[PDB]
Amino acid sequence: MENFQKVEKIGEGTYGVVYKARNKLTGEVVALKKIRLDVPSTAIREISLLKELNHPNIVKLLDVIHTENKLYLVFEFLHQDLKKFMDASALTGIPLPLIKSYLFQLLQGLAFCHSHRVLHRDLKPQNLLINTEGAIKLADFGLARGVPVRTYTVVTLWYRAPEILLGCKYYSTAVDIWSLGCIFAEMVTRRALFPGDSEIDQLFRIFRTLGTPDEVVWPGVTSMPDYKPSFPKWARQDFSKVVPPLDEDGRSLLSQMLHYDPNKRISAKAALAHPFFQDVTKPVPHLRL
Ligand SMILES: CCS(=O)(=O)c1ccc(Nc2ncc3cc(Cl)c(=O)n(C4CCCC4)c3n2)c(C)c1
């Protein structure tokens, strides 16, 4: 609304485009997500329920403005996401204390949302915002269900859990833990874990690494909707080849977040007690804003 002055386009995506905005009344710098609605009464309640989500590791939804065929969402503004930070460290590598602090902070925000029965669904490095004080926050939570922008926004697929790719309709909190494990491996190796091009290439890249799942490790996988008995049967690779710098504690923790069975996958709460975070600290990054 005229109360906000658009400064620059900082993003674009699913039916939504995000601007850096300045509240002309208060002077506050905020993130303004514009969603062309062409109004779901059910949705604007769940949006109002995420306004109550309150945690230092979650980008705060400040205000919800419904005006005509548009839904404006005002968020707390941050200057950089984890994707821009990983690119700026592709040659040097993020130090493990900074990686460990980040993973610890994201597991806290995940443990907060999951205790409120709130999924993120669409966890990716572009959705993880960082500041200069060493904090990292979860951003842009995906609703369970506007007009798509024609200018358009592939990398969401790289972090999808295998249960979503196999056609499970009822997601659990384990889908967010899987995405975090892929992000955790990407931070260490400075390379995407499963950079697939299609739904089946994403599935087969996971199969080539973790082995093709069966009823032994994932009971009920053969009864999943998009499962096919004609899947190739690949052998599981060694975890020391997946993340070849990481220590045994991290590889252990990463292996539990990458379990095929969502019921065997580690929860955010249990992950916080993993010995990998025994010496967890909070270092500061070197950001160029
Ligand atoms: C552009 C790459 S970057 O690293 O330069 C960069 C990254 C982040 C931000 N800021 C920022 N601040 C607050 C939010 C709040 C929400 Cl909800 C949100 O979705 N996003 C974006 C993340 C997904 C697309 C919009 C936000 N972005 C800036 C200025 C640059």
Tab-separated table of C-alpha atoms and ligand atoms in Angstrom:
chain	number	residue	atom	x	y	z
A	1	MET	CA	0.000	0.000	0.000
A	2	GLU	CA	0.988	3.673	-0.351
A	3	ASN	CA	2.296	3.347	3.211
A	4	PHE	CA	5.246	1.401	1.732
A	5	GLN	CA	7.906	2.642	-0.701
A	6	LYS	CA	9.407	-0.091	-2.872
A	7	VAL	CA	13.208	0.124	-2.854
A	8	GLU	CA	14.338	-2.911	-4.861
A	9	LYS	CA	13.127	-6.337	-5.935
A	10	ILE	CA	14.869	-8.818	-3.641
A	11	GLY	CA	13.095	-11.964	-4.834
A	12	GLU	CA	10.333	-13.609	-6.835
A	13	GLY	CA	8.690	-16.982	-6.633
A	14	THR	CA	5.520	-19.034	-6.203
A	15	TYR	CA	2.756	-16.569	-7.197
A	16	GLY	CA	4.680	-13.987	-5.188
A	17	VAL	CA	7.280	-11.274	-5.623
A	18	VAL	CA	9.196	-9.811	-2.670
A	19	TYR	CA	10.405	-6.215	-2.449
A	20	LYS	CA	12.593	-4.361	0.000
A	21	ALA	CA	10.119	-1.806	1.346
A	22	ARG	CA	10.298	1.198	3.661
A	23	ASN	CA	7.239	2.031	5.744
A	24	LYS	CA	6.648	5.667	4.766
A	25	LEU	CA	5.055	6.276	8.188
A	26	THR	CA	7.511	4.582	10.574
A	27	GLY	CA	10.624	4.387	8.383
A	28	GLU	CA	10.979	0.659	9.049
A	29	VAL	CA	12.766	-1.405	6.408
A	30	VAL	CA	10.682	-4.538	5.797
A	31	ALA	CA	10.214	-7.352	3.293
A	32	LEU	CA	7.010	-6.905	1.281
A	33	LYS	CA	5.695	-10.043	-0.437
A	34	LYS	CA	3.035	-9.264	-3.046
A	35	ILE	CA	0.610	-12.085	-3.885
A	36	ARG	CA	-1.956	-11.417	-6.618
A	37	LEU	CA	-5.141	-13.115	-5.360
A	38	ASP	CA	-7.311	-14.078	-8.333
A	39	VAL	CA	-9.052	-14.436	-1.616
A	40	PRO	CA	-9.262	-17.819	0.106
A	41	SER	CA	-10.942	-17.414	3.495
A	42	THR	CA	-9.342	-20.627	4.774
A	43	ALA	CA	-5.829	-19.517	3.790
A	44	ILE	CA	-5.954	-16.049	5.376
A	45	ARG	CA	-6.662	-17.698	8.730
A	46	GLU	CA	-3.627	-20.005	8.549
A	47	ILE	CA	-1.628	-16.949	7.485
A	48	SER	CA	-2.882	-15.240	10.653
A	49	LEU	CA	-1.804	-18.301	12.656
A	50	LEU	CA	1.794	-17.993	11.423
A	51	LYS	CA	1.736	-14.398	12.644
A	52	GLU	CA	1.723	-16.026	16.114
A	53	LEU	CA	4.808	-18.136	15.326
A	54	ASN	CA	7.464	-16.484	17.491
A	55	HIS	CA	11.051	-17.712	17.661
A	56	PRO	CA	14.479	-16.050	17.259
A	57	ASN	CA	15.221	-18.415	14.350
A	58	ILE	CA	12.036	-17.659	12.372
A	59	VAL	CA	11.597	-14.602	10.156
A	60	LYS	CA	8.778	-12.750	11.880
A	61	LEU	CA	5.600	-12.111	9.900
A	62	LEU	CA	4.921	-8.537	10.989
A	63	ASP	CA	1.622	-7.716	9.274
A	64	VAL	CA	-0.941	-9.221	6.898
A	65	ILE	CA	-2.638	-6.722	4.583
A	66	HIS	CA	-5.553	-7.790	2.461
A	67	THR	CA	-6.518	-5.242	-0.059
A	68	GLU	CA	-8.491	-6.144	-3.143
A	69	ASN	CA	-7.104	-8.777	-5.431
A	70	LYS	CA	-3.827	-8.639	-3.541
A	71	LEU	CA	-2.350	-10.027	-0.332
A	72	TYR	CA	0.601	-8.112	1.001
A	73	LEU	CA	2.742	-9.886	3.609
A	74	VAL	CA	5.150	-7.733	5.629
A	75	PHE	CA	8.174	-9.613	6.973
A	76	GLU	CA	11.248	-8.769	9.008
A	77	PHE	CA	14.032	-7.793	6.612
A	78	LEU	CA	17.433	-9.495	6.363
A	79	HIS	CA	20.258	-8.671	3.972
A	80	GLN	CA	21.574	-12.060	2.819
A	81	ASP	CA	20.463	-15.665	2.472
A	82	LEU	CA	22.522	-18.827	2.832
A	83	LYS	CA	22.718	-19.263	-0.957
A	84	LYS	CA	24.532	-15.951	-1.472
A	85	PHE	CA	26.786	-16.795	1.481
A	86	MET	CA	27.672	-20.264	0.186
A	87	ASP	CA	28.549	-18.819	-3.222
A	88	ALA	CA	30.785	-16.202	-1.572
A	89	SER	CA	32.512	-19.108	0.232
A	90	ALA	CA	32.665	-21.636	-2.619
A	91	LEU	CA	36.451	-21.205	-2.873
A	92	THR	CA	37.288	-21.013	0.845
A	93	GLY	CA	34.499	-23.025	2.481
A	94	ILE	CA	32.326	-22.131	5.464
A	95	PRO	CA	34.166	-23.095	8.682
A	96	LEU	CA	32.709	-26.051	10.554
A	97	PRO	CA	32.001	-23.990	13.724
A	98	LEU	CA	29.865	-21.665	11.592
A	99	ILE	CA	28.208	-24.642	9.895
A	100	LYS	CA	27.562	-26.263	13.286
A	101	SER	CA	26.101	-23.052	14.734
A	102	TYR	CA	23.842	-22.623	11.700
A	103	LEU	CA	22.595	-26.219	11.765
A	104	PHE	CA	21.968	-25.938	15.511
A	105	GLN	CA	19.982	-22.713	15.061
A	106	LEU	CA	17.870	-24.125	12.222
A	107	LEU	CA	17.071	-27.224	14.283
A	108	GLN	CA	15.836	-24.960	17.087
A	109	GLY	CA	13.450	-23.083	14.803
A	110	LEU	CA	12.327	-26.379	13.300
A	111	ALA	CA	11.773	-27.808	16.792
A	112	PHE	CA	9.609	-24.780	17.584
A	113	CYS	CA	7.420	-24.996	14.469
A	114	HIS	CA	7.039	-28.773	14.660
A	115	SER	CA	5.879	-28.524	18.275
A	116	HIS	CA	3.131	-26.231	16.948
A	117	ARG	CA	2.351	-28.724	14.134
A	118	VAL	CA	3.721	-26.339	11.499
A	119	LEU	CA	5.634	-27.625	8.481
A	120	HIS	CA	7.946	-25.613	6.274
A	121	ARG	CA	7.606	-27.998	3.283
A	122	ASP	CA	9.888	-25.888	1.081
A	123	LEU	CA	13.226	-25.685	2.881
A	124	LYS	CA	16.057	-24.449	0.669
A	125	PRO	CA	19.187	-22.293	1.066
A	126	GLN	CA	17.398	-19.285	-0.463
A	127	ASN	CA	14.849	-19.565	2.380
A	128	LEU	CA	17.499	-19.362	5.138
A	129	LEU	CA	18.354	-15.755	5.989
A	130	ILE	CA	21.447	-14.653	7.915
A	131	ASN	CA	22.492	-11.418	9.618
A	132	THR	CA	25.842	-10.011	10.728
A	133	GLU	CA	25.368	-11.168	14.341
A	134	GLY	CA	25.708	-14.833	13.331
A	135	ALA	CA	21.992	-15.653	13.448
A	136	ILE	CA	20.114	-17.691	10.846
A	137	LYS	CA	16.331	-17.749	10.441
A	138	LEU	CA	13.749	-19.777	8.548
A	139	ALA	CA	11.895	-17.787	5.887
A	140	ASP	CA	9.005	-18.232	3.439
A	141	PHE	CA	7.011	-21.085	4.932
A	142	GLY	CA	5.003	-23.106	2.422
A	143	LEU	CA	1.255	-23.319	2.970
A	144	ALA	CA	-0.521	-26.659	2.588
A	145	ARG	CA	-2.126	-25.205	-0.562
A	146	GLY	CA	-3.124	-16.786	-6.632
A	147	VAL	CA	-2.098	-16.165	-10.223
A	148	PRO	CA	1.476	-17.276	-11.015
A	149	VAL	CA	3.855	-14.560	-12.151
A	150	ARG	CA	4.546	-14.802	-15.884
A	151	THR	CA	8.159	-13.684	-15.402
A	152	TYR	CA	8.419	-17.047	-13.591
A	153	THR	CA	10.678	-18.450	-10.876
A	154	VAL	CA	13.890	-26.106	-10.010
A	155	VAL	CA	15.989	-26.023	-6.828
A	156	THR	CA	13.026	-26.865	-4.643
A	157	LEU	CA	13.273	-30.312	-6.123
A	158	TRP	CA	16.870	-30.726	-4.904
A	159	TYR	CA	15.681	-30.816	-1.270
A	160	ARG	CA	12.419	-32.783	-1.523
A	161	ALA	CA	12.093	-35.777	0.772
A	162	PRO	CA	11.664	-39.160	-0.965
A	163	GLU	CA	8.181	-39.574	0.538
A	164	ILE	CA	6.938	-36.442	-1.240
A	165	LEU	CA	8.536	-37.635	-4.491
A	166	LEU	CA	6.925	-41.075	-4.107
A	167	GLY	CA	3.471	-39.490	-3.914
A	168	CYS	CA	2.709	-39.327	-0.190
A	169	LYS	CA	-0.213	-36.932	0.245
A	170	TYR	CA	0.066	-36.440	4.032
A	171	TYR	CA	3.449	-34.953	4.916
A	172	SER	CA	5.078	-35.204	8.325
A	173	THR	CA	7.642	-32.971	10.004
A	174	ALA	CA	10.302	-35.362	8.660
A	175	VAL	CA	10.179	-33.680	5.238
A	176	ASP	CA	11.799	-30.575	6.742
A	177	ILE	CA	14.500	-32.634	8.470
A	178	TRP	CA	15.396	-34.234	5.129
A	179	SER	CA	15.755	-30.840	3.450
A	180	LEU	CA	17.980	-29.666	6.301
A	181	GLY	CA	20.222	-32.702	5.857
A	182	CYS	CA	20.692	-31.820	2.190
A	183	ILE	CA	21.514	-28.236	3.157
A	184	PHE	CA	23.902	-29.514	5.835
A	185	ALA	CA	25.796	-31.612	3.269
A	186	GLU	CA	25.809	-28.724	0.769
A	187	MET	CA	27.423	-26.396	3.312
A	188	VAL	CA	30.212	-28.887	4.019
A	189	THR	CA	31.056	-30.027	0.485
A	190	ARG	CA	30.122	-26.742	-1.275
A	191	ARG	CA	28.121	-28.835	-3.756
A	192	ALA	CA	24.474	-29.824	-4.034
A	193	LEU	CA	23.717	-33.248	-2.581
A	194	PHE	CA	21.033	-34.377	-5.069
A	195	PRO	CA	20.836	-31.808	-7.905
A	196	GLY	CA	18.167	-33.522	-9.985
A	197	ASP	CA	16.549	-32.241	-13.167
A	198	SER	CA	13.193	-34.061	-13.006
A	199	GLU	CA	11.075	-35.767	-10.368
A	200	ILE	CA	12.519	-39.138	-11.379
A	201	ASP	CA	16.112	-37.913	-11.732
A	202	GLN	CA	15.833	-36.469	-8.224
A	203	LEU	CA	14.571	-39.855	-7.035
A	204	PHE	CA	17.261	-41.778	-8.921
A	205	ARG	CA	20.063	-39.494	-7.708
A	206	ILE	CA	18.953	-40.271	-4.156
A	207	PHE	CA	18.766	-43.986	-5.016
A	208	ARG	CA	22.258	-43.956	-6.541
A	209	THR	CA	23.661	-42.557	-3.272
A	210	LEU	CA	21.582	-44.033	-0.430
A	211	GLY	CA	20.587	-47.237	-2.248
A	212	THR	CA	17.181	-48.150	-3.650
A	213	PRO	CA	14.773	-48.522	-0.701
A	214	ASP	CA	12.891	-51.756	-0.063
A	215	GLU	CA	10.483	-53.136	2.546
A	216	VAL	CA	13.487	-53.883	4.795
A	217	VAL	CA	14.653	-50.326	5.493
A	218	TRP	CA	11.344	-48.613	4.586
A	219	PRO	CA	8.318	-50.817	5.352
A	220	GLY	CA	5.456	-49.785	3.092
A	221	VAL	CA	7.514	-48.068	0.392
A	222	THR	CA	6.286	-50.496	-2.273
A	223	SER	CA	2.676	-49.501	-1.510
A	224	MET	CA	3.374	-45.812	-2.135
A	225	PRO	CA	1.444	-44.201	-5.022
A	226	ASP	CA	4.298	-43.164	-7.338
A	227	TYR	CA	6.412	-46.213	-6.484
A	228	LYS	CA	7.145	-48.577	-9.367
A	229	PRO	CA	8.457	-52.165	-9.052
A	230	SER	CA	10.547	-51.391	-12.156
A	231	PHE	CA	12.863	-49.033	-10.252
A	232	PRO	CA	16.568	-49.788	-10.763
A	233	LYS	CA	18.186	-51.451	-7.751
A	234	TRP	CA	21.287	-49.413	-6.907
A	235	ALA	CA	23.672	-50.138	-4.050
A	236	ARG	CA	24.157	-47.710	-1.177
A	237	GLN	CA	27.398	-45.736	-1.300
A	238	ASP	CA	29.691	-45.062	1.638
A	239	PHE	CA	28.941	-41.914	3.622
A	240	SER	CA	32.657	-41.062	3.677
A	241	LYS	CA	32.300	-40.393	-0.065
A	242	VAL	CA	29.200	-38.211	0.351
A	243	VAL	CA	30.665	-35.638	2.777
A	244	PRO	CA	34.398	-36.450	2.739
A	245	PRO	CA	35.554	-33.668	5.108
A	246	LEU	CA	32.962	-34.227	7.825
A	247	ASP	CA	33.718	-36.004	11.106
A	248	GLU	CA	32.028	-39.165	12.360
A	249	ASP	CA	29.615	-37.201	14.568
A	250	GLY	CA	28.357	-35.129	11.648
A	251	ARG	CA	28.196	-38.098	9.280
A	252	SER	CA	26.282	-39.930	12.008
A	253	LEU	CA	23.885	-37.007	12.486
A	254	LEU	CA	23.551	-36.514	8.721
A	255	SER	CA	22.741	-40.209	8.227
A	256	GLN	CA	19.816	-39.984	10.669
A	257	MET	CA	18.351	-36.939	8.918
A	258	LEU	CA	18.661	-38.777	5.578
A	259	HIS	CA	16.789	-41.922	6.633
A	260	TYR	CA	14.385	-43.248	4.017
A	261	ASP	CA	11.673	-44.154	6.527
A	262	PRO	CA	10.201	-40.858	7.805
A	263	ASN	CA	9.339	-42.649	11.052
A	264	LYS	CA	13.019	-43.537	11.533
A	265	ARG	CA	14.249	-40.053	10.578
A	266	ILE	CA	15.522	-38.064	13.552
A	267	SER	CA	13.341	-35.294	14.939
A	268	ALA	CA	14.515	-31.714	15.368
A	269	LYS	CA	14.234	-32.139	19.146
A	270	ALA	CA	16.346	-35.304	19.238
A	271	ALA	CA	18.885	-33.833	16.806
A	272	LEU	CA	19.625	-30.999	19.247
A	273	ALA	CA	20.907	-33.594	21.744
A	274	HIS	CA	23.290	-35.190	19.239
A	275	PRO	CA	26.930	-35.232	20.443
A	276	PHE	CA	27.860	-33.314	17.270
A	277	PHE	CA	26.622	-30.180	19.089
A	278	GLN	CA	28.672	-30.869	22.227
A	279	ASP	CA	31.065	-27.983	21.480
A	280	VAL	CA	28.570	-25.853	19.551
A	281	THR	CA	29.291	-22.121	19.676
A	282	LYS	CA	28.031	-19.007	17.854
A	283	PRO	CA	30.656	-17.511	15.543
A	284	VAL	CA	30.045	-14.442	13.415
A	285	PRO	CA	30.173	-14.554	9.599
A	286	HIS	CA	32.038	-12.205	7.275
A	287	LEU	CA	29.170	-10.685	5.300
A	288	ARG	CA	29.466	-8.078	2.547
A	289	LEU	CA	26.122	-6.269	2.609
B	1	LIG	C1	18.264	-12.224	-3.208
B	1	LIG	C2	19.425	-13.126	-2.788
B	1	LIG	S1	20.366	-12.333	-1.456
B	1	LIG	O1	21.065	-13.299	-0.684
B	1	LIG	O2	21.025	-11.165	-1.928
B	1	LIG	C3	19.155	-11.695	-0.350
B	1	LIG	C4	18.425	-12.538	0.470
B	1	LIG	C5	17.481	-12.017	1.337
B	1	LIG	C6	17.256	-10.645	1.374
B	1	LIG	N1	16.321	-10.069	2.247
B	1	LIG	C7	15.149	-10.655	2.700
B	1	LIG	N2	14.655	-10.205	3.849
B	1	LIG	C8	13.538	-10.689	4.359
B	1	LIG	C9	12.867	-11.688	3.648
B	1	LIG	C10	11.623	-12.274	4.134
B	1	LIG	C11	11.036	-13.237	3.379
B	1	LIG	CL1	9.553	-13.965	3.914
B	1	LIG	C12	11.618	-13.661	2.164
B	1	LIG	O3	11.029	-14.534	1.546
B	1	LIG	N3	12.777	-13.123	1.706
B	1	LIG	C13	13.426	-13.544	0.446
B	1	LIG	C14	13.834	-15.033	0.481
B	1	LIG	C15	13.050	-15.718	-0.657
B	1	LIG	C16	12.811	-14.583	-1.685
B	1	LIG	C17	12.523	-13.347	-0.794
B	1	LIG	C18	13.412	-12.141	2.425
B	1	LIG	N4	14.541	-11.594	1.991
B	1	LIG	C19	18.003	-9.807	0.552
B	1	LIG	C20	17.789	-8.316	0.579
B	1	LIG	C21	18.943	-10.332	-0.307
